[PDB]
Design a protein around this nucleic acid. Structure first.
Ligand SMILES: [Mg+2]
Ligand SMILES: [Mg+2]
Ligand SMILES: [Mg+2]
Lengths: 144, 189, 51, 145, 57, 75, 143, 68, 64
RNA sequence: CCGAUAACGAACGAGACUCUGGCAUGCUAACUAGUUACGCGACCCCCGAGCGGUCGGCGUCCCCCAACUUCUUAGAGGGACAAGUGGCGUUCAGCCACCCGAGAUUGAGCAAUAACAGGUCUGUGAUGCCCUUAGAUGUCCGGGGCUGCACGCGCGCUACACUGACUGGCUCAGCGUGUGCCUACCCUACGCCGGCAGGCGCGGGUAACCCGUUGAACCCCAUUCGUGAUGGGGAUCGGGGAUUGCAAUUAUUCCCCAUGAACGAGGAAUUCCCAGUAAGUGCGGGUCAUAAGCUUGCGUUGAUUAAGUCCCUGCCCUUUGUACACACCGCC
């Protein structure tokens, strides 16, 4: 009832946008940068923010306390860094403190829906080359 | 139950033709809340088949330079267009979407280079993947040029384009284009 | 032609034309090709590739 | 109130020697008068204390004549000194704002000022060439042929 | 040029080297220029090992 | 397709027409109702929010670009 | 259930504060508000008459989120895209005088004070007023 | 595509099969560990490329004769 | 009198054709009667087993 | 590469290699990076939430006065090899599909034998010969020009609009630069004045210490506009005000107010491109006393089509012919 030292800190990144989720024993609440998930910046993609709790159920999130700190990337990249780090934090929390029999039966739901929830996207960028505007496009050439 | 856009359950929609059954991705396995993901569906051949069809439409709609990266903007356009079609007809926005895709896909085409020395326009039959590609492209272009120089918005023109292709009444741009492709195919079978 | 034929079983005929070529028209029309020094000595007709 | 047209509506309304369509908003209608852009139209209406949400035909004659005397008299109505076309005039040194064909004949006057003293811009204007030093090597072909 | 370049190739191989290569380019006794290349032994050209395996002047 | 010269303000024959037949078909948007009544379109939005405040129509989306209304349900 | 500004919608909170400052007619408003542009990169004056109240609302909220900001930091936040006509677009700051008049008006309102270093932070009274308005605007948004 | 082994990796793989046959087995990771000390390979990439082809070869020779 | 629109399943991809690879010949079987299997040249990305629509039955496809 | 095989064994190039990206809750650590926990605070709270919520508020190497490296930095190591499975294949080389996996094709750098009378003598105290050398083709100083316009062409920037413009609010980066041998020129926080471009004091930074949590744009959300050369577009031109420079006219740049031209998606043709790619979108470096529509990089949003062919255009190889061998720009 008053036991300390039960906390995990699992990050999740996408396109140079890192989000670190700090999960702790407590009443069920999730906050990102000290703000509720529902009050998120790109409100049109807010369903992506709150879908991991939709599939997993609010009962599983009822015994946790998540606070996320984010920096880097853009709006979309920070959104994916949020949903990835949230889904990672409690599944690693379950692995640390409860049996992994429960971890496996929530992990298979996460991977069957969206594997990016628990596996980072490796693609970052590509360097620009000295003959065109970008990485692969080349400057227009003329013959006459 | 998947609640696409928070509503519009995907368990009631069906695909009538087996040719396009395993190329549209509305079923519960490919059912997602939003048509927005980093799915890497163009990584290799035959991966876009399991990409959700609503995500395919919201990807093929950002076109013509000024709007090519604005996926959040295209998703909100799909939001309003889906609201309009549901309001106008009363059926599932996915059911009319699948209905328009099937009727807009040209079932036959012509290779146009069947005789390279002098063009022959040899007839040819299309693949199911080419069907969904051409149908989505035709519908997106019809919605694009319908609301180019008039008061009506993109979401509304996409809405009437979808319903017109869903029935087929010679006023959908995709329907006219498909009928033209079939017509020239019949001319040079 | 077979569908429109009034006969229940008709065999379409064959054109039997024997063609005579000078070596310049034969080469230009790709009937015969240049060959190696050793290849020129082989007089067997080229395979039909019938299967 | 989005109701039928008020009976005191003028679809064509005369200000100075130019007509301004009453259908459009006041701020973007009076801009048809020479010498007033959007920034000058908005400040004079803001000082005239008129609701911008209505159209030009909605204005009554007293409001119209009030925005008239506002624009020809900016200095006396506390309009800032940097909103004027003719700040620090070259013939009398009086800071003024010009709103009519007086702008056309004053631009005409400045044109012949350089022209009579044969300054470089006067010669360039007379020859019909660019005056701000931009290259004429490849641009401006439309205005000559 | 042949006498000098062959003399230095013999000296380099005598002192011990996997390979060497001298190129003399320019004009001698005439207007038209020419290049002579004197090689022997192993010689690599590409990649990082060139940096710490090849001495150039 | 030459010009449209849409009405900038309602008249007797159009203001009564929207009050009598606009809230009768399902799709109610400023763009559709503007091309239907030949009105400009700022008229469409302003009068359409007046119909909202009256209570003759229902609001579904309310987006800054595409705002959608509907007829009230009959039953 | 206490309410902080980070728990509510920022746009509705800002317009709620501007209404609060409008009814409390004590905030000093410079005489040239009706004429000037909010930034160099702007083409038209703001549509709203009470843009000064709205900007003061945004400024107070921004200082609460990150204190220690000055006038130069303010113009970066209210900076934006400058179209530059036919040349390609760039980025431009905001009006420094507008930022100063807002920050000094907040100073006279006793909700903004100088820091131990440069810049201005909120007073505890201004923090109190921010959270009280945040609570009442959470009630309005909910019901 | 593009997984063809160079003659460098192929010949090195054959040679260590010739001399060290009992020391090696069917497991890739064990084969790459014995490759560390039965031969010196300055590249880790070459090390497990050689070891990969060794397991491929030894799998083939477990049921027949090859050019080794 | 008109032959009805029917469907045929891909059995095996024969290979590209059409002097540019824009179309691939492929053998198909008809689900209505599986004994009939003919060759048709198709355009677009084609795998094995996927079913395609046919507006005609008799015409086998030759090269190009 | 494998196989046929008068060849066997090799070498260069390819590959390998170096750098870079992608995973390591494994290792070594960090007051010039932090994170949790705790102590004071500031506010909302009180319905009471109380190990309640927020705080880029202050602190716990103010060295006796917490621990740790997940996030950040950078070293050493690991890790992926067609490794496993199924199918095809001479059942060889290898190819396809799938599983597990961060990754089952991350981008560059380097890059052979040789050729192109390819470009550079205007990069050089690289350089032969020729020219000039006191009324100089040396060198300095002043002014002008390199910008000059009936026209043609190339690289581009901005647009033709409502998938938009304007107004306001919200809101997220990463490369990377920064005060000088000569050398005169730095990045700028904070406060004060003006509407602006700007000016004046007070500092900090030779730098993970300061700018700077680089509060970037696009985007997102609200307002107005309403298919109209219109609130699209901002060319042209007038007046005024600043900044740098000894010097601003032939406008250096920037700012304010005025005018508002073509442009309603573009013929024949033609360019670039396969995944964080194209494209939209801004930001640094170089150029710089003043300077980006250029270039070089970086980040943000982020696609359609394709996993093929020799049809067009080229290139390579083999055979073949040759009176060419300075090699078809030949010979004759
Ligand atoms: Mg290499
Ligand atoms: Mg102007
Ligand atoms: Mg002969």
């Amino acid at each position: 009832s008053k036991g300390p030292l039960q906390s995990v800190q699992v990050f999740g990144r996408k396109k140079t946008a890192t989000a670190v989720a700090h999960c702790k024993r407590g009443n069920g609440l999730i906050k990102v940068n000290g703000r509720p998930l529902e009050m998120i910046e790109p409100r049109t993609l807010q369903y992506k923010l709150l879908e991991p709790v939709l599939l997993l159920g609010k009962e599983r999130f009822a015994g946790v306390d998540i606070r996320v700190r984010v920096k880097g990337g853009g709006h979309v990249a920070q959104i994916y860094a949020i949903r990835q780090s949230i889904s990672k934090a409690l599944v690693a929390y379950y692995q640390k403190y409860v049996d992994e029999a429960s971890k496996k039966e929530i992990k298979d739901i996460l991977i069957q829906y969206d594997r990016t929830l628990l596996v980072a996207d490796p693609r970052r960028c590509e360097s620009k080359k000295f003959g065109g505007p970008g990485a692969r496009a080349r400057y227009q050439k003329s013959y006459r | 139950d998947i609640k696409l856009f928070g509503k519009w359950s995907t368990d009631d929609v069906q695909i009538n033709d087996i040719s396009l059954q395993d190329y549209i991705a509305v079923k519960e396995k490919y059912a997602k809340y939003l048509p927005h993901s980093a799915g890497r569906y163009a990584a290799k051949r035959f991966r876009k088949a399991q990409c959700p069809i609503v995500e395919r439409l919201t990807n093929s709609m950002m076109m013509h330079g000024r709007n090519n990266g604005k996926k959040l903007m295209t998703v909100r356009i799909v939001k309003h267009a889906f609201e309009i079609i549901h309001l106008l007809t009363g059926e599932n926005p996915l059911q009319v979407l699948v209905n328009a895709i099937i009727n807009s896909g040209p079932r036959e085409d012509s290779t146009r280079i069947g005789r390279a020395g002098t063009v022959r326009r040899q007839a040819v039959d299309v693949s199911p993947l080419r069907r969904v590609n051409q149908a989505i492209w035709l519908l997106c272009t019809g919605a694009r040029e319908a609301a180019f120089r008039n008061i009506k918005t993109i979401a509304e023109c996409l809405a009437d384009e979808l319903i017109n292709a869903a029935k087929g009444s010679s006023n959908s741009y995709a329907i006219k284009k498909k009928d033209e492709l079939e017509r020239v195919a019949k001319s040079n079978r | 032609i077979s569908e429109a034929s009034v006969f229940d079983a008709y065999v379409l005929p064959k054109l039997y034309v024997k063609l005579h070529y000078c070596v310049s028209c034969a080469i230009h029309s790709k009937v015969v090709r240049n060959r190696s020094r050793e290849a020129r000595k082989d007089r067997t007709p080229p395979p039909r590739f019938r299967p | 109130m989005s109701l039928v047209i008020p009976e005191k509506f003028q679809h064509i309304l005369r200000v100075l020697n130019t007509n301004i369509d009453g259908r459009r908003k006041i701020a973007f209608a009076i801009t048809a008068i020479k010498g007033v852009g959007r920034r000058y139209a908005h400040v004079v209406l803001r000082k005239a204390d008129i609701d911008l949400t209505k159209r030009a035909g909605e204005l009554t004659e007293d409001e119209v004549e009030r925005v008239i005397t506002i624009m020809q008299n900016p200095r006396q109505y506390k309009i800032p000194d940097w909103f004027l076309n003719r700040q620090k005039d070259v013939k009398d040194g009086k800071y003024s704002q010009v709103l009519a064909n007086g702008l056309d004949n004053k631009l005409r006057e400045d044109l012949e000022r350089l022209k009579k003293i044969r300054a470089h811009r006067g010669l360039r204007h007379f020859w019909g060439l660019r005056v701000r030093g931009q290259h004429t090597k490849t641009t401006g072909r439309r205005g000559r042929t | 040029v042949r006498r000098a370049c062959y003399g230095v190739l013999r000296f380099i191989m005598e002192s011990g080297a996997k390979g060497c290569e001298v190129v003399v380019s320019g004009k001698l006794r005439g207007q038209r220029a020419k290049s002579m290349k004197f090689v022997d032994g192993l010689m690599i050209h590409s990649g990082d090992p060139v940096n710490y395996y090849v001495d150039t002047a | 397709r030459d010009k449209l010269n849409n009405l900038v303000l309602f008249d007797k024959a159009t203001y009564d027409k929207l009050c009598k037949e606009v809230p009768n078909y399902k799709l109610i948007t400023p763009a559709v109702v503007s091309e239907r009544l030949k009105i400009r379109g700022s008229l469409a939005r302003a009068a359409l929010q007046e119909l909202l405040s009256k209570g003759l129509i229902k609001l579904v989306s309310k987006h800054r670009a595409q705002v959608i209304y509907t007829r009230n349900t009959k039953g | 259930p206490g309410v902080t500004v980070k728990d509510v919608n920022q746009q509705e909170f800002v317009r709620a504060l501007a209404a609060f400052l409008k009814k409390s007619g004590k905030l000093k408003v410079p005489e040239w508000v009706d004429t000037v542009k909010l930034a160099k990169h702007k083409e038209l004056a703001p549509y709203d008459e009470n843009w000064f109240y709205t900007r003061a609302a945004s400024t107070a909220r921004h200082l609460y989120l990150r204190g220690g900001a000055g006038v130069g930091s303010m113009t970066k936040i209210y900076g934006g895209r400058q179209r530059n006509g036919v040349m390609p677009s760039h980025f431009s700051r905001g009006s420094k005088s507008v930022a100063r008049r807002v920050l000094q008006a907040l100073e006279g309102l006793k909700m903004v004070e100088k820091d131990q270093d440069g810049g201005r932070k909120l007073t505890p009274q201004g923090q109190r007023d921010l959270d009280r308005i945040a609570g009442q605007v959470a009630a309005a948004n909910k019901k | 595509m593009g997984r063809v082994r160079t003659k460098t990796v192929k010949k090195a793989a054959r040679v260590i099969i010739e001399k060290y046959y009992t020391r090696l087995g069917n497991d890739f990771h064990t084969n790459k560990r014995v490759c560390e000390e039965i031969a010196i390979i300055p590249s880790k990439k070459l090390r497990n490329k050689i070891a990969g082809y060794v397991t491929h070869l030894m799998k083939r020779i477990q049921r027949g004769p090859v050019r080794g | 009198r008109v032959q009805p629109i029917k469907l045929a399943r891909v059995t095996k991809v024969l290979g590209r054709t059409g002097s540019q690879g824009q179309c691939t010949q492929v053998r198909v079987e008809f689900m209505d009667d599986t004994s009939r299997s003919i060759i048709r040249n198709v355009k677009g990305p084609v795998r094995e087993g996927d079913v395609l629509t046919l507006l005609e039955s008799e015409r086998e496809a030759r090269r190009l």
